[PDB]
Amino acid sequence: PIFLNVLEAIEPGVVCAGHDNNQPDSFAALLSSLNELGERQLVHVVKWAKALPGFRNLHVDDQMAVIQYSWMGLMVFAMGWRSFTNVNSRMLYFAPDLVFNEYRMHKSRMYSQCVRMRHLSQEFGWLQITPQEFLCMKALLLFSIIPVDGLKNQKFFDELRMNYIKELDRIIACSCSRRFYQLTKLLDSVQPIARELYQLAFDLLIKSHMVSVDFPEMMAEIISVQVPKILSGKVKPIYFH
Ligand SMILES: C[C@]12CCC(=O)C[C@@H]1CC[C@@H]1[C@@H]2CC[C@]2(C)[C@@H](O)CC[C@@H]12
Numbered sequence: 109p110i111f112l113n114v115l116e117a118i119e120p121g122v123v124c125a126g127h128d129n130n131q132p133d134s135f136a137a138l139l140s141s142l143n144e145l146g147e148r149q150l151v152h153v154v155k156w157a158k159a160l161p162g163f164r165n166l167h168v169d170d171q172m173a174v175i176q177y178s179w180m181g182l183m184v185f186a187m188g189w190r191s192f193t194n195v196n197s198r199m200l201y202f203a204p205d206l207v208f209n210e211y212r213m214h215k216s217r218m219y220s221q222c223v224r225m226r227h228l229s230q231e232f233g234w235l236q237i238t239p240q241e242f243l244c245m246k247a248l249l250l251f252s253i254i255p256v257d258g259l260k261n262q263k264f265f266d267e268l269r270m271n272y273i274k275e276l277d278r279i280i281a282c283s284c285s286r287r288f289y290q291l292t293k294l295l296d297s298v299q300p301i302a303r304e305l306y307q308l309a310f311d312l313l314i315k316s317h318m319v320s321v322d323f324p325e326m327m328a329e330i331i332s333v334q335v336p337k338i339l340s341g342k343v344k345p346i347y348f349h
């Protein structure tokens with residue numbers, strides 16, 4: 109169980125958004141706290157990724173690129189699990205101090221995306237996803253979006269991605285065929301959700317100075333430098349099906 113030992117050991121702990129819950133639920137306050145949460149979680153995503161088995165086998169530029177393309181999907185998948193285990197999926201548990209009810213879903217102007225995120229959360233229940241399955245699936249999400257022109261050493265990436273697929277297969281194996289199909293269909297469903305959120309993030313950054321929404325340093329950098337490569341089709345998800 110070496111692989112699962114590692115995934116459990118490096119899983120990030122609780123991250124708070126810093127949200128002042130006694131101010132009114134305005135669009136600007138809610139989106140500014142979500143952006144701050146993203147900035148805080150990005151720190152943990154980087155430290156988590158660098159500690160994954162085999163990750164340092166990747167070229168150093170590929171390491172940062174893969175994090176900078178997959179972070180939305182990783183963060184939404186993890187938030188979906190938090191929601192399933194904490195509020196049982198009619199609310200979104202972005203953080204202990206940033207829990208979206210239906211009112212916040214509307215005031216954030218993200219209601220339809222939150223609905224889809226809620227559906228993703230509920231699938232952990234409908235499919236009875238185990239903690240071990242969640243951990244392996246989340247790791248695989250780091251290796252599920254790349255440039256169409258390929259990475260700087262694509263061969264090492266393809267080997268590492270293969271090995272994470274094998275680990276998922278082992279965790280299921282420890283019926284199997286139906287399970288693997290279910291989990292890979294679930295993984296595929298993350299990318300379209302992440303794409304819609306990437307679109308929202310980009311549009312909000314462009315008009316941020318006018319809706320009074322503050323973007324932290326690394327969020328502003330990644331949404332203006334890397335996210336447009338996804339939105340323009342230069343960086344694309346790897347789907348199973
Ligand atoms: C990743 C975050 C923050 C971390 C998390 O739990 C998931 C959530 C998904 C929506 C993202 C948000 C970060 C800030 C974004 C990108 C806003 O700009 C628009 C959509 C928000």
